[PDB]
Design a protein around this ligand. Structure first.
Ligand SMILES: [Ca+2]
Ligand SMILES: [Ca+2]
Ligand SMILES: [Ca+2]
Ligand SMILES: [Ca+2]
Ligand SMILES: [Ca+2]
Length: 432
């Protein structure tokens, strides 16, 4: 088991996508498209591993940290097998992929990845031109740049405010735990002297009567921090709380929950900026496409009230695959071995063996692969036919391993809670 970064080579693209066509690049709105075709040296063996490292300005999820699951094992799309398993170490900006026995069973291994990844605002607190974003696949660095341009804080007279959703874990349709979301509110980011300041945060908007936002004393947790003099707030709403002064204890008597998913924070007379962190639980919903809206309004004496807010939309038996290999069993021993190659143009026909009803069919590709999808748990008869002329069927069920043997022309396999890729056929062509 060793690092084989020097035994892969890739054609990689890393592209900044202006997702909202704003003509500006903002971490909260835009994203990075990473694509790579990776060629793996034949010397690589199972348990070897390669890494994908990304720069400090890159992260592998957006608002939902559970989206890390979208960047997972690398699979062969033709035959359904896993080529390498993925392990994230987000603290080290690292993905480690460990090769499976795929690379012991096949030469000329090639892999594709197609990921959406995200910009990390942690080190981009303000507008900056030519910010680099880098991904290192094996030993090859792919670097792209973009100008980062954040929106301005909302203002009304001497009142100013900003807000963003910073984390959303939504389980739409789950009654036990609908999930949670976090919002950050910058209070008075323009650093003014405001008289009788009050902040109203509300999961309420007249346009959204089915809002799944929720604010009340039982589900909501609020932290308040004072911003030191001269501190530059992160315009991407990445808050390093160690840089700020926790003043949550000072907002007893000043914290009031109210109707329509509201909470009111009485700041009084203030001369600094404040960061308000709001953690709260989603409401449950039956709907397929719910909406979350949460507003924040700062009011003070002698100034127009300023409002800002954020809005987001969300989304709400098992079947499996059978396969997957017809190969030319050169040494006739009935066992799939490295260097023996797949056979194309062989017909596979699959039946539910308990009803004798046809459930799928395929023709093997040039690499010998086939897949039969959409099969629930059951017993399935797999019939091979239309072998190449001159070829004979190799001996069946050799080698004491039903994943590496030949099933013969007709056999029955059981699908039980996972893909069953063990219905394989070995053939050879006699010369004598
Ligand atoms: Ca944009
Ligand atoms: Ca290999
Ligand atoms: Ca063999
Ligand atoms: Ca088998
Ligand atoms: Ca197989």
């Amino acid at each position: 088991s060793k690092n084989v970064n020097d035994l892969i080579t890739s054609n990689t693209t890393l592209t900044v996508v202006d997702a909202d066509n704003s003509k500006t690049i903002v971490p909260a709105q835009d994203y990075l498209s990473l694509k790579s075709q990776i060629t793996v040296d034949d010397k690589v063996k199972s348990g070897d591993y390669f890494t994908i490292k990304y720069s400090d300005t890159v992260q592998v999820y957006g608002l939902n940290p559970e989206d890390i699951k979208n960047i997972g094992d690398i699979k062969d799309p033709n035959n359904g097998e896993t080529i390498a398993t993925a392990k994230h170490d987000t603290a080290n900006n690292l993905i480690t992929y460990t090769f499976t026995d795929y690379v012991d069973r096949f030469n000329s291994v090639k892999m594709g990845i197609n990921y959406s990844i995200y910009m990390d605002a942690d080190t981009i607190p303000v507008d900056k031109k030519d910010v680099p974003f880098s991904v290192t696949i094996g030993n090859q660095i792919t670097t792209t740049t973009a100008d980062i341009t954040y929106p301005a804080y909302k203002e009304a007279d001497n009142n100013s405010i900003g807000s963003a959703f910073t984390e959303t874990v939504s389980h739409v349709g789950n009654v036990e735990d609908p999930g949670y979301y976090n919002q950050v509110v910058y209070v008075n980011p323009m650093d003014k002297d405001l008289k009788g300041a009050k902040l109203k945060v509300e999961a309420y908007h007249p346009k959204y009567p089915t809002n799944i936002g929720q604010i009340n004393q039982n589900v909501t947790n609020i932290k308040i921090y004072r911003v030191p003099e001269g501190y530059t707030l992160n315009k991407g709403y990445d808050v390093n709380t160690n840089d700020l002064v926790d003043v949550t204890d000072e907002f007893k008597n000043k914290m009031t929950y109210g109707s329509n998913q509201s909470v009111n924070l009485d700041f009084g007379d203030i001369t600094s900026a404040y960061v308000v962190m709001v953690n709260t639980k989603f409401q449950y919903t039956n709907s397929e496409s719910p909406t979350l809206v949460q507003m924040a309004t700062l009011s003070s004496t002698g100034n127009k009230s300023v409002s800002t807010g954020n809005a987001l939309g969300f989304t709400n038996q098992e079947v499996y695959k059978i396969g997957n290999y017809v190969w030319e069993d050169t040494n006739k021993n009935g066992v799939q071995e490295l260097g023996e190659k797949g056979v194309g143009n062989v017909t596979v026909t699959v039946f539910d063996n308990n009803t004798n009803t046809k459930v799928g069919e395929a023709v093997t590709k040039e690499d010998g692969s086939y897949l039969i999808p959409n099969l629930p748990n059951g017993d399935y008869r797999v019939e091979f036919s239309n072998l190449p002329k001159g070829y004979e069927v190799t001996p069946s069920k050799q080698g004491n391993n039903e994943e590496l043997d030949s099933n013969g022309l007709s056999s029955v396999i059981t699908v039980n809670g996972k893909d069953n890729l063990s219905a394989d056929l070995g053939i050879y062509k006699p010369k004598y």
